[PDB]
Coordinates of C-alpha atoms and ligand atoms in Angstrom, one line a residue:
Chain A
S1 CA 6.5 9.3 47.2
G2 CA 8.5 12.1 49.1
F3 CA 10.6 11.5 52.1
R4 CA 10.7 14.1 54.9
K5 CA 12.4 14.4 58.5
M6 CA 9.3 13.2 60.4
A7 CA 8.5 13.4 64.1
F8 CA 5.8 11.1 65.7
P9 CA 2.6 12.7 66.5
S10 CA 3.0 14.7 69.7
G11 CA -0.6 14.4 71.1
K12 CA 0.0 11.6 73.6
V13 CA 3.1 13.5 75.1
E14 CA 1.5 16.9 75.1
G15 CA -1.0 15.5 77.6
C16 CA 2.0 14.6 79.9
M17 CA 3.7 18.1 79.9
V18 CA 3.4 20.1 83.2
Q19 CA 5.2 23.2 84.6
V20 CA 7.5 22.7 87.5
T21 CA 8.6 25.7 89.5
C22 CA 11.1 25.6 92.4
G23 CA 12.0 29.0 93.8
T24 CA 12.6 31.3 90.8
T25 CA 13.4 28.4 88.3
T26 CA 10.5 27.3 85.9
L27 CA 11.0 24.4 83.5
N28 CA 9.0 21.4 82.2
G29 CA 8.0 18.1 83.9
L30 CA 6.6 14.8 82.6
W31 CA 3.3 13.7 84.5
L32 CA 2.8 9.9 84.1
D33 CA 0.3 8.3 86.5
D34 CA 0.8 10.1 89.9
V35 CA 4.5 11.1 89.3
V36 CA 5.9 14.2 87.7
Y37 CA 9.5 13.7 86.3
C38 CA 11.8 16.8 86.0
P39 CA 15.6 17.6 86.1
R40 CA 16.9 17.8 89.6
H41 CA 18.8 21.1 88.6
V42 CA 15.3 22.8 89.1
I43 CA 16.3 23.3 92.6
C44 CA 19.6 25.2 91.8
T45 CA 20.3 28.8 91.8
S46 CA 22.8 29.8 88.7
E47 CA 25.3 30.1 91.6
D48 CA 24.6 26.5 92.7
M49 CA 25.0 25.2 89.1
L50 CA 28.8 25.8 89.4
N51 CA 29.3 23.0 92.0
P52 CA 26.0 21.8 93.4
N53 CA 25.7 19.0 96.0
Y54 CA 22.3 17.9 95.0
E55 CA 21.7 15.7 98.2
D56 CA 22.5 18.8 100.4
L57 CA 20.6 21.3 98.3
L58 CA 17.5 19.0 98.3
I59 CA 17.3 18.9 102.2
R60 CA 16.3 22.6 102.0
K61 CA 13.4 21.6 99.8
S62 CA 9.8 20.3 100.9
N63 CA 7.0 18.9 98.7
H64 CA 5.4 22.4 99.0
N65 CA 8.4 24.1 97.4
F66 CA 7.7 22.2 94.1
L67 CA 4.8 24.0 92.3
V68 CA 3.3 21.8 89.5
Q69 CA 0.7 23.2 87.2
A70 CA -1.1 21.1 84.4
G71 CA -2.4 23.9 82.2
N72 CA -4.2 26.2 84.7
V73 CA -4.8 23.5 87.5
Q74 CA -2.2 23.0 90.3
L75 CA -1.2 19.5 91.4
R76 CA -0.6 18.6 95.1
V77 CA 2.9 17.3 95.7
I78 CA 2.7 14.5 98.4
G79 CA 6.3 13.2 97.9
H80 CA 9.6 13.9 96.2
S81 CA 12.7 11.7 95.6
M82 CA 16.0 12.0 93.7
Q83 CA 16.6 9.2 91.1
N84 CA 20.1 9.8 89.7
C85 CA 19.8 13.3 88.0
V86 CA 15.7 13.4 87.9
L87 CA 13.3 14.4 90.5
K88 CA 10.2 12.3 90.8
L89 CA 7.4 14.3 92.5
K90 CA 4.4 12.3 93.7
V91 CA 1.1 14.1 93.0
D92 CA -2.2 13.2 94.6
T93 CA -3.9 12.9 91.2
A94 CA -2.9 10.4 88.4
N95 CA -2.7 12.1 85.0
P96 CA -6.0 11.2 83.3
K97 CA -4.3 11.3 79.9
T98 CA -1.4 9.0 80.9
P99 CA -0.8 6.8 77.7
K100 CA 0.6 3.3 77.6
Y101 CA 4.4 4.0 78.1
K102 CA 7.9 2.6 78.7
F103 CA 11.2 4.2 79.8
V104 CA 13.8 3.0 77.3
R105 CA 17.7 3.9 77.3
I106 CA 18.4 4.3 73.6
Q107 CA 21.8 3.5 71.9
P108 CA 23.5 6.2 69.8
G109 CA 22.4 6.3 66.2
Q110 CA 18.7 5.7 67.5
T111 CA 16.3 8.5 66.6
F112 CA 13.4 9.9 68.6
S113 CA 11.0 12.9 68.5
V114 CA 11.4 15.9 71.0
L115 CA 8.4 17.9 72.1
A116 CA 10.1 21.3 72.9
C117 CA 8.1 22.8 75.9
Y118 CA 8.3 26.2 77.7
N119 CA 6.4 26.4 81.1
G120 CA 4.9 23.0 80.4
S121 CA 3.4 24.3 77.2
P122 CA 4.4 22.5 74.0
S123 CA 5.9 25.0 71.3
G124 CA 7.0 22.4 68.6
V125 CA 8.1 19.0 67.6
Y126 CA 11.3 17.8 65.7
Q127 CA 13.2 14.5 65.1
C128 CA 16.6 13.9 66.7
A129 CA 19.3 11.1 67.0
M130 CA 21.4 10.2 70.0
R131 CA 24.7 11.1 68.4
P132 CA 27.7 8.7 68.8
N133 CA 29.2 11.3 71.2
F134 CA 26.0 11.1 73.3
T135 CA 25.0 14.7 72.5
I136 CA 21.8 15.6 70.5
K137 CA 21.5 18.5 68.2
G138 CA 18.3 20.1 69.6
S139 CA 16.6 23.5 69.7
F140 CA 16.3 24.4 73.5
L141 CA 16.1 27.9 75.1
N142 CA 15.9 28.6 78.8
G143 CA 12.6 26.9 80.2
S144 CA 12.9 24.0 77.6
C145 CA 14.6 21.7 80.3
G146 CA 12.4 18.6 81.1
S147 CA 11.3 18.6 77.4
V148 CA 11.3 14.8 76.6
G149 CA 12.2 12.7 73.5
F150 CA 10.2 9.7 72.7
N151 CA 9.2 6.9 70.1
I152 CA 5.6 5.7 69.8
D153 CA 5.1 2.0 69.0
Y154 CA 1.4 2.5 67.8
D155 CA -0.2 3.2 71.2
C156 CA 2.9 2.6 73.6
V157 CA 5.2 5.8 74.1
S158 CA 8.8 4.8 74.8
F159 CA 10.3 7.9 76.6
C160 CA 14.1 7.9 76.0
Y161 CA 15.2 11.4 76.8
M162 CA 14.8 14.3 79.2
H163 CA 16.6 17.7 78.4
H164 CA 19.1 19.0 81.0
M165 CA 22.2 20.7 79.6
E166 CA 23.5 23.0 76.7
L167 CA 27.2 22.7 76.2
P168 CA 28.9 26.0 75.2
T169 CA 29.3 24.6 71.7
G170 CA 25.4 24.7 71.5
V171 CA 24.7 20.9 71.4
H172 CA 22.5 19.3 74.1
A173 CA 22.9 16.7 76.9
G174 CA 20.3 14.9 79.0
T175 CA 19.0 11.8 80.7
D176 CA 17.0 8.7 80.2
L177 CA 13.8 8.9 82.4
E178 CA 15.7 7.0 85.1
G179 CA 17.9 10.1 85.5
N180 CA 21.1 8.6 84.0
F181 CA 22.9 10.9 81.5
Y182 CA 23.7 9.8 78.0
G183 CA 27.5 9.8 77.8
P184 CA 29.9 11.4 80.3
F185 CA 27.9 14.5 80.8
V186 CA 26.7 15.9 84.3
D187 CA 24.1 18.5 85.6
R188 CA 27.0 20.9 86.5
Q189 CA 28.2 24.2 84.7
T190 CA 31.8 23.0 84.2
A191 CA 34.2 22.4 81.2
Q192 CA 32.3 19.6 79.4
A193 CA 33.3 19.2 75.6
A194 CA 31.5 16.9 73.2
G195 CA 33.8 14.2 71.6
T196 CA 34.0 13.7 67.8
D197 CA 30.5 13.8 66.2
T198 CA 30.9 10.6 64.1
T199 CA 28.3 9.9 61.2
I200 CA 25.9 7.1 61.8
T201 CA 26.9 4.9 58.6
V202 CA 23.9 2.5 58.9
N203 CA 21.5 5.5 59.0
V204 CA 23.1 7.2 55.9
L205 CA 22.7 3.9 54.1
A206 CA 19.0 3.6 55.1
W207 CA 18.5 7.2 53.8
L208 CA 20.3 6.1 50.5
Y209 CA 17.9 3.2 50.2
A210 CA 15.0 5.8 51.0
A211 CA 16.4 7.9 48.2
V212 CA 16.5 5.2 45.5
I213 CA 12.8 4.1 46.7
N214 CA 11.8 7.8 46.0
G215 CA 13.5 8.1 42.6
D216 CA 16.7 9.9 43.6
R217 CA 19.2 7.3 42.0
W218 CA 22.0 9.5 40.3
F219 CA 24.5 8.2 43.0
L220 CA 24.0 4.5 42.2
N221 CA 27.4 3.4 40.6
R222 CA 28.9 0.2 39.0
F223 CA 31.3 -0.6 42.0
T224 CA 30.8 -2.9 45.1
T225 CA 33.0 -3.1 48.2
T226 CA 33.7 -5.1 51.3
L227 CA 33.0 -4.2 55.0
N228 CA 36.9 -4.0 55.5
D229 CA 37.5 -1.9 52.4
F230 CA 34.4 0.3 53.2
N231 CA 35.5 0.9 56.8
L232 CA 39.0 2.1 55.8
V233 CA 36.9 5.0 54.0
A234 CA 34.6 5.3 57.0
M235 CA 37.6 5.7 59.5
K236 CA 39.1 8.5 57.3
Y237 CA 35.6 10.3 57.2
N238 CA 34.6 10.0 60.9
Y239 CA 31.9 7.5 60.0
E240 CA 30.9 4.6 62.5
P241 CA 32.5 1.3 61.5
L242 CA 29.9 -0.8 59.7
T243 CA 29.2 -4.2 61.1
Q244 CA 27.5 -7.4 59.7
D245 CA 24.7 -6.4 62.2
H246 CA 24.2 -3.0 60.3
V247 CA 24.2 -5.0 57.1
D248 CA 21.6 -7.5 58.6
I249 CA 19.6 -4.5 59.8
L250 CA 19.5 -3.1 56.1
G251 CA 18.4 -6.5 54.7
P252 CA 14.7 -5.7 54.3
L253 CA 15.6 -2.4 52.5
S254 CA 18.2 -4.3 50.3
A255 CA 15.3 -6.8 49.6
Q256 CA 12.7 -4.3 48.5
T257 CA 15.1 -2.2 46.2
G258 CA 17.2 -5.2 45.0
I259 CA 20.5 -3.4 45.8
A260 CA 22.9 -5.3 47.9
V261 CA 24.0 -3.4 51.1
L262 CA 27.7 -3.6 49.9
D263 CA 26.8 -2.0 46.5
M264 CA 25.1 0.8 48.5
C265 CA 28.3 1.0 50.7
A266 CA 30.4 1.4 47.5
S267 CA 27.8 4.2 46.5
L268 CA 28.4 6.0 49.9
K269 CA 32.2 5.5 49.5
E270 CA 32.2 7.3 46.2
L271 CA 30.0 10.1 47.7
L272 CA 32.5 10.4 50.6
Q273 CA 35.5 10.6 48.3
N274 CA 34.0 12.7 45.7
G275 CA 31.2 14.6 47.5
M276 CA 27.8 15.6 45.9
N277 CA 29.4 17.9 43.1
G278 CA 26.6 20.5 43.9
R279 CA 23.8 17.9 43.5
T280 CA 21.2 16.9 46.2
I281 CA 19.6 13.6 47.5
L282 CA 16.1 13.8 49.0
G283 CA 16.4 17.8 48.9
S284 CA 19.6 17.6 51.1
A285 CA 23.3 18.6 50.1
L286 CA 25.0 16.4 52.7
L287 CA 24.5 12.8 53.7
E288 CA 21.6 12.6 56.4
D289 CA 22.3 10.2 59.3
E290 CA 19.0 11.0 61.4
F291 CA 16.9 8.3 59.7
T292 CA 17.3 4.7 61.0
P293 CA 16.4 1.7 58.8
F294 CA 13.3 1.4 61.0
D295 CA 12.4 5.1 60.3
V296 CA 12.9 4.4 56.5
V297 CA 10.7 1.3 56.5
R298 CA 8.0 3.1 58.7
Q299 CA 7.8 6.1 56.4
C300 CA 8.3 4.2 53.1
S301 CA 5.5 1.7 54.1
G302 CA 3.2 4.0 56.0
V303 CA 2.9 2.6 59.5
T304 CA 0.7 4.5 62.2
Chain B
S1 CA 20.6 27.6 71.2
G2 CA 20.0 25.1 68.4
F3 CA 17.6 25.7 65.5
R4 CA 15.7 22.7 64.1
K5 CA 13.0 22.3 61.4
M6 CA 10.1 22.3 63.8
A7 CA 6.4 21.3 63.3
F8 CA 3.6 22.6 65.7
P9 CA 2.5 20.0 68.2
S10 CA 0.0 17.6 66.4
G11 CA -2.3 16.9 69.4
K12 CA -5.0 19.3 68.5
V13 CA -5.2 18.0 64.8
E14 CA -4.9 14.3 65.7
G15 CA -8.3 14.7 67.5
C16 CA -9.8 15.9 64.2
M17 CA -8.6 12.9 61.8
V18 CA -11.1 10.2 60.8
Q19 CA -11.1 7.6 58.1
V20 CA -13.4 8.1 55.1
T21 CA -14.1 5.0 52.9
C22 CA -16.2 5.3 49.6
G23 CA -16.5 2.0 47.8
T24 CA -13.0 0.5 47.8
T25 CA -11.2 3.9 48.4
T26 CA -10.1 4.7 51.9
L27 CA -8.4 8.0 52.8
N28 CA -8.4 10.7 55.7
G29 CA -11.1 13.2 56.6
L30 CA -11.0 16.3 58.9
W31 CA -13.8 16.2 61.6
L32 CA -14.5 19.7 62.8
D33 CA -17.9 20.3 64.7
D34 CA -20.6 18.0 62.7
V35 CA -18.6 18.1 59.4
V36 CA -16.0 15.7 57.9
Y37 CA -13.9 17.3 55.2
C38 CA -12.3 15.0 52.7
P39 CA -11.0 15.1 49.0
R40 CA -13.9 14.8 46.5
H41 CA -11.7 12.1 44.6
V42 CA -12.7 9.5 47.4
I43 CA -15.7 8.8 45.0
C44 CA -13.4 7.9 42.0
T45 CA -12.2 4.6 40.6
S46 CA -8.7 4.7 39.3
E47 CA -10.5 4.5 35.9
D48 CA -12.7 7.7 36.8
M49 CA -9.4 9.5 37.9
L50 CA -8.5 9.9 34.1
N51 CA -11.4 12.2 33.2
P52 CA -14.0 12.3 36.2
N53 CA -17.2 14.5 36.1
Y54 CA -17.5 14.8 39.8
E55 CA -21.1 16.1 39.7
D56 CA -22.2 13.1 37.7
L57 CA -20.0 10.6 39.8
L58 CA -21.5 12.2 43.0
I59 CA -25.3 11.5 41.9
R60 CA -24.5 7.7 42.3
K61 CA -23.4 8.4 46.0
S62 CA -25.8 8.6 49.0
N63 CA -25.0 9.6 52.7
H64 CA -24.8 5.8 53.5
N65 CA -22.1 5.1 50.9
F66 CA -19.6 7.4 52.8
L67 CA -18.2 5.3 55.7
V68 CA -16.7 7.7 58.5
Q69 CA -14.8 6.0 61.4
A70 CA -13.2 8.0 64.3
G71 CA -10.9 5.4 65.8
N72 CA -13.1 2.4 66.3
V73 CA -16.6 4.3 66.4
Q74 CA -18.6 4.9 63.2
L75 CA -20.1 8.4 62.6
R76 CA -23.7 8.7 61.0
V77 CA -23.6 10.7 57.7
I78 CA -26.8 12.9 57.5
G79 CA -25.6 15.0 54.6
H80 CA -22.9 15.5 51.9
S81 CA -22.2 18.3 49.5
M82 CA -19.3 19.2 47.2
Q83 CA -17.6 22.5 47.9
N84 CA -14.9 23.0 44.9
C85 CA -12.7 19.9 45.2
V86 CA -13.6 18.9 49.0
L87 CA -16.7 16.9 50.2
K88 CA -18.2 18.2 53.4
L89 CA -20.0 15.0 55.1
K90 CA -22.5 16.3 57.8
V91 CA -22.3 13.7 60.8
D92 CA -25.0 13.6 63.5
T93 CA -22.3 14.1 66.3
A94 CA -20.1 17.2 66.6
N95 CA -16.4 16.1 67.2
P96 CA -16.0 16.6 71.0
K97 CA -12.2 17.4 70.5
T98 CA -12.8 20.2 67.8
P99 CA -10.2 23.0 68.8
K100 CA -10.7 26.6 68.0
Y101 CA -10.0 26.8 64.3
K102 CA -9.9 28.8 61.1
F103 CA -9.7 27.9 57.4
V104 CA -6.8 30.2 55.9
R105 CA -5.6 30.2 52.3
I106 CA -1.8 30.7 52.7
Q107 CA 0.4 32.5 50.1
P108 CA 3.5 30.8 48.7
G109 CA 6.6 31.0 51.0
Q110 CA 4.3 30.6 54.0
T111 CA 5.2 27.3 56.1
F112 CA 2.8 24.9 58.0
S113 CA 2.9 21.5 59.6
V114 CA 1.6 18.4 58.0
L115 CA 0.1 15.5 60.0
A116 CA 0.6 12.5 57.6
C117 CA -2.3 10.0 58.2
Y118 CA -3.2 6.6 57.1
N119 CA -6.9 5.3 57.6
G120 CA -7.6 8.4 59.7
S121 CA -4.6 7.3 62.1
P122 CA -1.7 9.8 62.4
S123 CA 1.7 8.4 61.5
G124 CA 4.1 11.4 61.6
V125 CA 4.4 15.3 61.6
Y126 CA 6.7 17.5 59.5
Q127 CA 7.1 21.2 58.5
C128 CA 6.4 22.3 54.9
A129 CA 6.2 25.5 52.8
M130 CA 3.7 26.4 50.1
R131 CA 6.4 26.6 47.2
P132 CA 6.2 29.6 44.7
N133 CA 5.1 27.0 42.1
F134 CA 2.2 26.0 44.4
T135 CA 3.5 22.5 45.0
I136 CA 4.6 21.3 48.5
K137 CA 7.5 18.8 49.1
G138 CA 5.7 16.2 51.3
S139 CA 5.8 12.6 52.3
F140 CA 2.5 10.9 51.1
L141 CA 1.9 7.2 50.2
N142 CA -1.6 5.9 49.1
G143 CA -4.2 6.4 52.0
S144 CA -2.5 9.7 52.9
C145 CA -5.0 12.0 51.0
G146 CA -7.1 14.2 53.4
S147 CA -4.0 14.6 55.6
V148 CA -4.0 18.3 56.4
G149 CA -1.4 21.2 56.9
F150 CA -2.0 23.7 59.6
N151 CA -0.6 26.5 61.8
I152 CA -1.5 26.9 65.6
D153 CA -1.8 30.5 66.9
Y154 CA -1.6 29.4 70.7
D155 CA -5.0 27.6 71.0
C156 CA -6.6 28.5 67.4
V157 CA -5.6 26.0 64.6
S158 CA -5.5 27.7 61.2
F159 CA -5.9 24.8 58.7
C160 CA -4.4 25.7 55.3
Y161 CA -3.9 22.5 53.3
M162 CA -5.6 19.1 52.5
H163 CA -3.5 16.7 50.4
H164 CA -5.0 15.6 47.1
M165 CA -2.3 14.8 44.3
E166 CA 1.2 13.5 43.7
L167 CA 2.6 14.8 40.4
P168 CA 4.7 12.2 38.4
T169 CA 7.8 14.3 39.6
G170 CA 7.1 13.2 43.2
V171 CA 5.9 16.7 44.4
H172 CA 2.5 17.2 46.1
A173 CA -0.6 19.4 45.3
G174 CA -3.8 20.0 47.3
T175 CA -6.4 22.5 48.3
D176 CA -7.3 24.9 51.2
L177 CA -10.2 23.6 53.4
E178 CA -12.7 25.5 51.0
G179 CA -11.6 22.8 48.4
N180 CA -9.7 25.4 46.1
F181 CA -6.4 24.0 44.8
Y182 CA -3.2 25.8 45.4
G183 CA -1.9 26.8 41.8
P184 CA -3.3 25.5 38.6
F185 CA -3.5 21.8 39.8
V186 CA -6.6 19.6 39.3
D187 CA -7.9 16.3 41.0
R188 CA -7.5 14.7 37.5
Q189 CA -4.8 11.9 36.5
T190 CA -3.5 14.2 33.6
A191 CA -0.2 15.8 32.3
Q192 CA 0.3 18.3 35.1
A193 CA 3.9 19.6 35.6
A194 CA 5.3 21.9 38.4
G195 CA 6.6 25.3 37.2
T196 CA 10.2 26.5 38.4
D197 CA 10.7 25.7 42.1
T198 CA 12.0 29.2 43.0
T199 CA 13.7 29.7 46.4
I200 CA 11.9 31.9 48.9
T201 CA 14.6 34.7 49.4
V202 CA 12.9 36.2 52.6
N203 CA 12.8 32.7 54.1
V204 CA 16.6 32.0 53.4
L205 CA 17.5 35.6 54.9
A206 CA 15.3 34.7 58.1
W207 CA 17.3 31.4 58.3
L208 CA 20.7 33.4 57.9
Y209 CA 19.4 35.6 60.8
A210 CA 18.7 32.4 62.8
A211 CA 22.2 31.1 62.1
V212 CA 24.0 34.3 63.3
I213 CA 21.6 34.1 66.4
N214 CA 22.8 30.6 67.1
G215 CA 26.6 31.2 66.5
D216 CA 27.0 30.2 62.8
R217 CA 28.5 33.4 61.5
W218 CA 31.4 32.4 59.0
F219 CA 29.3 33.7 56.0
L220 CA 29.1 37.3 57.4
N221 CA 31.2 39.4 55.1
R222 CA 32.4 43.1 54.6
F223 CA 29.9 43.9 51.8
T224 CA 26.4 45.4 51.5
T225 CA 24.1 45.5 48.5
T226 CA 20.9 47.3 47.1
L227 CA 17.5 45.6 46.4
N228 CA 18.0 46.2 42.7
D229 CA 21.7 44.9 42.7
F230 CA 20.7 41.7 45.0
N231 CA 17.7 41.1 42.7
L232 CA 20.0 40.7 39.7
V233 CA 21.7 37.9 41.5
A234 CA 18.3 36.5 42.8
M235 CA 17.0 36.4 39.1
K236 CA 20.1 34.5 37.9
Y237 CA 19.7 31.9 40.8
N238 CA 15.9 31.4 40.5
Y239 CA 15.2 33.2 44.0
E240 CA 12.1 35.3 44.6
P241 CA 12.7 38.9 43.9
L242 CA 13.1 40.7 47.3
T243 CA 10.7 43.5 48.0
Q244 CA 10.8 46.4 50.6
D245 CA 8.0 44.4 52.3
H246 CA 10.4 41.3 52.8
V247 CA 12.9 43.9 54.2
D248 CA 10.2 45.3 56.5
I249 CA 9.2 41.8 57.5
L250 CA 13.0 41.0 58.4
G251 CA 13.2 44.3 60.6
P252 CA 12.7 42.6 64.0
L253 CA 15.6 40.0 63.2
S254 CA 17.7 42.9 61.8
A255 CA 17.1 44.8 65.1
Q256 CA 17.9 41.8 67.5
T257 CA 21.3 40.9 65.5
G258 CA 22.1 44.5 64.6
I259 CA 22.8 43.3 61.0
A260 CA 21.1 45.5 58.3
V261 CA 18.9 43.3 56.0
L262 CA 20.9 44.5 52.9
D263 CA 24.2 43.4 54.6
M264 CA 22.7 40.0 55.1
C265 CA 21.5 40.2 51.3
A266 CA 25.1 40.8 50.5
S267 CA 26.0 37.6 52.6
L268 CA 23.4 35.7 50.6
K269 CA 24.7 37.1 47.3
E270 CA 28.3 35.9 48.1
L271 CA 26.8 32.4 49.2
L272 CA 24.8 32.2 45.8
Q273 CA 27.9 33.2 43.7
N274 CA 30.6 31.2 45.7
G275 CA 28.5 28.4 47.3
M276 CA 29.3 26.9 50.8
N277 CA 32.8 25.6 49.8
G278 CA 32.0 22.4 51.7
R279 CA 30.9 24.3 54.9
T280 CA 27.5 24.1 56.6
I281 CA 25.1 26.6 58.2
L282 CA 22.9 25.3 61.2
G283 CA 23.9 21.7 60.0
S284 CA 22.7 22.2 56.4
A285 CA 24.8 22.2 53.2
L286 CA 22.4 24.3 51.1
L287 CA 20.3 27.5 51.9
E288 CA 17.1 26.6 53.8
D289 CA 14.0 28.4 52.5
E290 CA 11.3 26.6 54.8
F291 CA 11.5 28.9 57.7
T292 CA 9.6 32.2 57.7
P293 CA 10.7 35.2 59.6
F294 CA 7.8 34.4 62.0
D295 CA 9.1 30.8 62.3
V296 CA 12.6 32.3 63.3
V297 CA 11.2 34.7 65.8
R298 CA 8.9 32.0 67.3
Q299 CA 11.7 29.4 67.7
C300 CA 14.4 32.0 68.6
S301 CA 12.2 33.6 71.3
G302 CA 10.3 30.3 72.5
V303 CA 6.5 31.0 71.9
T304 CA 4.0 28.1 72.7
Ligands
T8S401 C1 17.0 24.3 80.5 C2 16.1 25.1 81.4 O1 15.0 25.2 81.2 N1 16.7 25.5 82.6 C3 18.0 25.3 82.9 C4 18.8 26.7 83.3 C5 18.0 27.5 84.3 C6 18.5 28.8 84.5 O2 18.3 29.7 83.8 N2 19.5 28.9 85.5 C7 21.0 28.8 85.1 C8 19.4 28.9 86.9 C9 19.5 27.5 87.6 C10 17.9 29.4 87.3 C11 16.5 27.5 83.9 C12 15.9 26.0 83.7
T8S402 C1 -3.9 10.1 48.2 C2 -4.8 8.9 48.6 O1 -4.9 8.4 49.7 N1 -5.7 8.4 47.7 C3 -5.6 9.0 46.1 C4 -5.3 7.7 45.3 C5 -6.3 6.6 45.5 C6 -6.0 5.4 44.6 O2 -5.2 4.6 45.0 N2 -6.7 5.3 43.5 C7 -5.9 5.7 42.2 C8 -8.0 5.1 43.2 C9 -8.9 6.4 43.0 C10 -8.7 4.2 44.4 C11 -6.4 6.3 47.0 C12 -6.6 7.5 47.9

C-alpha cells in the first residue's frame, strides 16, 4: 500500500545529459547516438530574445562555437542544423550510454518525469503532466533549459519534452524532441499568457481509484451520474469534459475495485460541489490530476 | 521559478540494486563493493513472520540458499552474517558501479529519495521524510522490501533507509543500513501502531519561504510572534515544537527573502488557526512538511 507522486528512475537519461555552451549562454543538451539536442535559443543574447531571427543569428555560428562537455570530457561538434526550435549538434563520438529510445509527442493530460539539470549535471527528478493549456508546472531556474521529460517502457526511453521557456506567471513551456512547442508558445521574450488550466478529469478519477485501492474510501457515496450530467458539473469547475474513451480507459481500474466509472464520477461530482470539508485523499487536500490511469495501474501493480 | 517535490537522480542507486531470493521469498538487495544488504526477514515463511527467532531460522540457511541476481547475471555468495535486522551477503565480485557512499542514520524531519524496486529492478523514485513517529509514507507493494532511501551529496550517496514493514494503517517502517529500525518497530507480524504523525514545523516554514521565493505570497500578514506564543499554537495542531536551532537553520532563507523567521511563524500560526480558505500554496491545499530548509536552498539555488 501507499500511493506517491513517482518519477521513473533517472539513470538512463542522466547518461544522456551534456553541457552546451554558446558564447556566454550555458544550458543542457541531450546526447543520443552522435547527436546533441538543445534549445536553439542557446545562440541568443538576452537582447536577441526580444525578437530573434534564428536563421540569421545561426549564420554567425560555426560547429566550433558550440562547446559540448559530457562530465569533464569535451565532444567534437562536426555538424549543426536547426530542426524547428531545437539545435541538433552532430558530435564525432556516439554516446556509449545511449539507451533504446523514441521521440514521442504527448497529448495534454499525459504525464512524464523531468530530470532537472544545470550545466549538463542532473540535480533532481519529479513527475509532470502536459497541462490542457500546454504548459507544465515544473521547477526550472536559469541553466535548466534542455532538461528533458520522458517515459520509460521497461528499457525504451520515450523522450516527450525539452524545457525552453518560463512564462511570467512562473509556468513552463517547451518542445517535443523534434523542436515543435507544445501549444501556441514560442522561444521569444514576448507577451505569452497560458490559457485556462483545466483539471484532467480522467486523471482525477484514476487517482480516486488509486485511493479506494489504498484504503481512502470516505468519499464513496450512494449516487451515480451520466456523462452528460457529470459534464455539466465538469464545465462549471473547469474540468476536461469526460468522454466514453476516458470511461473505457478507466475500465481496468473499474474491474479491479468493482466501482462503476460513473459511480466514481458521482463521487467526484459531490467532491467538486461540496469540497473535502478539511479531509484528505492520499495525503492530498485537493483533487490530484497528475496520475494517468496507466500511472495508477503501474504503481498499484508494481511494473518495472 | 516553480517548486516541485523533487527526488535525487536515481542512476547511482539503480546500479546498486540486485534481486535476493531465499526459498520462495524474492525481494531487493543493495550491492555495494562485495556485500549485498537485504532485510533479514527474506529467510521467513509468512508463518515464521508471526514470531520468528532469526538466529535459529538463520542456522537452516547456507550461502548457496541466498540467490543474488544483478540484472541477468548471478552473484556467488561466499559469506552471510546478520547485522541487527539486515543480512550482509558477501559476494565474490565487487559491484563495478559502486558509487562513493556512506551509511547515515537520519533524524525525523530529514528527507530522502526512495528508489522503489521489484525483483532488484527499479520501478520509480519519490521523495520522503522520516516522520516524527519514525514511520515513512511510501509506496511499497510485495517485492519492494530492500528498496533503499538515500541523499546524494554531489557524488557521495548517503544511504539512510532500507524498507522492511508495512503497518496495517498502510504506513511504512524500515532500518538504517546497519539494520537498526527507525523508532520502536520490529520485523515481526504483530500489533505495531504508529504514534501521532506530528507536522515538521521547520519544514513547513522552509516551504513557506520557498513559496514567497516563487511568488505565492497571499499568506504573508502584518503579525509577528514569539517561539513560546507560536509553540502554544504548534502544540494544539500537533506540530513539532520550534527551537532556536530551527530558527538558526532557517536564517539563510530569512536573509534571502528579508522575512524574519518569527514573522513567517506568525504567517503559519494564522494559516493553522484560519486554514487556507480554499486557496493553494505552491499548488498544494495543505501545509507541506516534506521539504527541509536544505531541500529549499538546494532547489531554489540549483545545486547538482
Ligand atoms: C532556461 C535556460 O537555462 N536558459 C534560458 C535563459 C538564458 C538567459 O539567462 N538569457 C536570457 C540569455 C539568453 C543568456 C540562459 C539559458
Ligand atoms: C516487502 C517485501 O517485499 N516482502 C515482505 C513480505 C514477504 C511476503 O510476502 N511474506 C509475508 C512471506 C514472508 C513470503 C515478501 C517480501
